[PDB]
Symmetry: C3
């Protein structure tokens, strides 16, 4: 009965172990890294299929998400969601400093300007695939999620204040979100074939231990106890539904790439209201620092062998939303403010390929558990609409 | 009562004087021009917020603008609008020659080919952010307004001939125009904070006098007397409404960047019919040469110290719609036809930063006063639809 | 009466002869090839006008084409269409080997990977104008038709399974297809002026004979006899309607560029059902190899003076959908698998300018005659919907 009910998640569990085993079976690499790319190809296709659906999901989710909700109420439960994104990050930043205290193993100012320049895009067509970042054309390949999310929020809320006239395109983007979420059903089945070929190509190439210690204790103790404190419901039962999304989080290593799956794992598996998931999930894929700030704060102290380092590490990953090799460049810029050499970066690249997979896993769990706290803390607002 | 009724325009007047004063207070610049960019940043954000809204306003304005109007009648009042864009330019070109007579202070052929190549875009997605211009990829960053306006006009009129089937997406773009015009309400409030920081960063760096003499006499005598001749109504009362747009025209220095504000200053402040503003304003932001041809014709004679120079100067700025540093490159190409050195251009760049602000001010007033003449000369066509 | 009924096709026939005559009248070229570009300009404008309409036609045709049809039935008549695209190619590849037997006159593996990478686009906005192809950014200018067609098919069929919710945007893209097909009426009239100036600029610059022999025998014997075998109707009567599209196929030399005209020549001239033309024509503009594989297979044997060469030549042109100079680069990659020098390519470029015009003519006829066979072999499926 277990193999019949939960069939696809047992396949992804089989894909993780088979991906490690087959990868370790073909570990002595006599072939050039060019041939490794040809081997990791079936997993590379899944990423293209997922990246395809990021843009028409993020745009359509928020536009309907802020329109379905009253402009006055949505602005209030939105501030309630900010409470989660700020508190969990504060505890994580604090946890990172204690973690290195017991077990010790482009300009800086320009990144705060590029983040503000990315928030308000110059062209929405250019925002859909090019992100702004000052270089010495500043626009470079990689979706400007921070700009599209900002426009979608103010555009979506403008439709809530429109009513009669606005009703047309709101029904359009809801049908569009339903269309893009009907394409995700097929992408979920290609995931086992993808993941096993994707992680196998990435394996064939004490700080590492420090990171996982803090990441697991935050995702299994800190975050679930925050959920149990307000909702008064078991967190593992909520975790059981989002299992098909948390396993893919390791393979994808991007919260944006897993967003189409994470959406179905909350709306279908756990049974969470669409009106709040469409409001929490897109913002959470960029604003949430729970896992990525906890990874970057530990990275700064390890190579050095306090308030200024934390703020710079936060504004780094928010500025580099879904751009390829985001963690690689952001760690360089954060070292200019502290005054540390860039020679140590040549070693963390050969260890980030497995550590970034767990970084996303905490980030995806945070947005999912965040929506669970939001739903319970906004039940009266949701009943007002019905 | 005056401070209560007209509050935001008194703030922009305060922003202009405070922008000059604070700029002159911090005039001795010990900092590198890189730091000037960081200072002019709050005004740089307003430009990104305005450029954001250009594209979804221009596309949606014309599509509904030509569909709401009868395909037979719209084609006729359109020719009536061409009468304005041709006559005012002829008088301006003539005024420029008299102005230099009393007070004397890529190829040419390729620009006429690039203009024709820009009119019909090869790809509408590429047209939304890349303009065609031959270089020795010809497509370069900067919206192809000339191509999007052309498509929107023939696409919008195709919906007027569609009727029943076409009614769906016409109601979509009208709701979309209403959405983009509901976002402009917040951008209008960021303008005082923007303008004061934007003009201050631009101040810290007899021909100049000749230009303003011709520009003021055209905008305060020539254009208002043309309005008073047909409408038989006071032009200053019409100018009083568009005050919030004319002040921003100095700061933005682009007729396209001020189009979202100019739209509200005509539809809300002066109380002009949407059906004709959506028809006159987008075309006027590119086709109108009243101020920019009057600036370029005087530029040619001053550095030289007749029919061929005027036509080449007209087709230059129409070809370079909203592309950055349009006046800088177009003045180089116009000198090849007359046979004059490019050494004189190194001096006008340090004076254009204040002169281009008044160039746009005449251009924005021309499109606004043009719509006023169009409304009065097409009252019977508008009554036919009701 | 003949000049009155069929007026525009007699003009395009006049354009072909006048284009050759005027071109041969101005054959001794004393002007640099830069001036030839300025001469071929009125035909260059038609191509921009046609390329403009490719993207909003391909996207809107398939989305409504798979939604109007039942998800179960469409998947079946789709397999019936694959029968045509596979059988006609098999006969063509076989015909090419017999044609060279009687009358004898980036990596290879990467192209099979790039084709799979193009099928699933990473970003739909980027897919609308940039195609993926590995180079040693892989994304380069030229519409990713293979990616947009794939998305449109799975997105369109997702709307058929949506019903009530999906009904909104399906009526949108059908009105949009009707809009883009109402713009094509004016482009059809610019074609005679275009073609005569476009072919004249291309003329002023035994293998050639071998190609036309096989191309004419396939398009006038093989393909029409396949039509007459199933439909039991005269093929020349069906060819008579699509005459306005077949003449333009010579001028455009691209099946995608002629798609907007080919659509009207089937829906209006021959009177074919929209539901199947919108399903056959976009796929046929890329997947069909009837003419282009017959051109490339003969190209390999001529320069050499069997199963491995045919498969590589097929996957080459499908990978290079509508990208400029597709036949030039694909012939280089196919020679690496066989092991032949690239010195022979410097001669075929000066002969492809007339041979590629007939290559498309066979490809356009194949898609048109394919739709004719599909309609007759799916009459019962079409009656089920009514
Ligand atoms: C800096 O990064 C952000 C931007 C937004 C948010 C919140 C959020 C989430 N999650 C969503 N979906 O909507 C709103 C939020 C508000 O705080 C306020 C709320 C809102 C209401 C009314 C007018 C607004 C005008 C501008 C911005 C937000 C507005 C909408 C959080 C972080
Ligand atoms: C060269 O730059 C331009 C293009 C257009 C215009 C006029 C205009 C303004 N303002 C608008 N909104 O629509 C039309 C205009 C016509 O003259 C004619 C009118 C029109 C009616 C019917 C069919 C047409 C077909 C092609 C072009 C315009 C057409 C529309 C002016 C300058
Ligand atoms: C490789 O290049 C292609 C892709 C598609 C096609 C066929 C086609 C044509 N012509 C169209 N318009 O739709 C479908 C086709 C199917 O074979 C199958 C059919 C279909 C039905 C149901 C689910 C599908 C899921 C994925 C792909 C096709 C699907 C749609 C042919 C070649
Ligand atoms: Ba957080
Ligand atoms: Ba509402
Ligand atoms: Ba004018
Ligand atoms: Ba109408
Ligand atoms: Ba075929
Ligand atoms: Ba249906
Ligand atoms: Rb990541
Ligand atoms: Rb300007
Ligand atoms: Rb071709």
């Amino acid at each position: 009965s277990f193999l019949r009910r939960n069939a696809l998640l047992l396949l992804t569990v089989l894909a993780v172990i088979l991906g490690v085993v087959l990868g370790f079976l073909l570990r002595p690499y006599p072939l050039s890294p060019r041939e490794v790319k040809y081997f990791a190809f079936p997993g590379e296709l899944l990423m293209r299929m997922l990246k395809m659906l990021i843009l028409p999901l993020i745009v359509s989710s928020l536009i309907t998400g802020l329109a379905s909700l009253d402009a006055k109420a949505s602005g209030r439960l939105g501030m309630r969601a900010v409470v989660y994104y700020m508190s969990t990050t504060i505890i994580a930043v604090v946890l990172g400093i204690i973690l290195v205290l017991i077990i010790h193993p482009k300009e800086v100012l320009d990144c705060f300007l590029d983040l503000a320049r990315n928030i308000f895009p110059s062209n929405l067509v250019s925002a859909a695939f090019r992100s702004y970042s000052t270089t010495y054309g500043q626009e470079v390949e990689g979706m400007n999620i921070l700009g599209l999310v900002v426009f979608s929020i103010v555009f979506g809320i403008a439709l809530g204040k429109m009513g009669e006239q606005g009703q047309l395109l709101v029904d359009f983007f809801n049908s569009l979100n339903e269309a893009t979420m009907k394409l995700v059903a097929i992408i979920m089945w290609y995931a086992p074939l993808g993941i096993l070929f994707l992680i196998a190509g990435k394996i064939v190439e004490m700080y590492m231990v420090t990171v996982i210690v803090g990441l697991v204790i935050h995702g299994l103790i800190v975050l679930p106890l925050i959920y149990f404190l307000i909702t008064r419901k078991n967190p593992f039962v909520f975790i059981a539904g989002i299992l098909q999304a948390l396993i893919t989080a390791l393979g994808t290593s991007s919260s944006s790439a897993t967003l189409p799956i994470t959406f179905k794992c909350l709306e279908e598996n756990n049974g969470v209201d669409k009106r709040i998931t469409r409001f929490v999930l897109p913002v959470g894929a960029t604003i949430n620092m729970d896992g990525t700030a906890l990874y970057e704060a530990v990275a700064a102290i390890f190579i050095a062998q306090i308030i200024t380092i934390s703020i710079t590490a936060t504004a780094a990953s928010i500025g580099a939303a879904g751009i390829p090799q985001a963690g690689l460049v952001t760690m360089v810029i954060v070292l200019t403010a502290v005054g540390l050499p860039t020679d140590d970066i040549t070693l963390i690249i050969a260890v980030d390929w497995l550590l970034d997979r767990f970084r996303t896993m905490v980030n995806v769990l945070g947005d999912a558990l965040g929506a669970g706290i939001v739903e319970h803390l906004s039940r009266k607002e949701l009943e007002k609409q019905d």
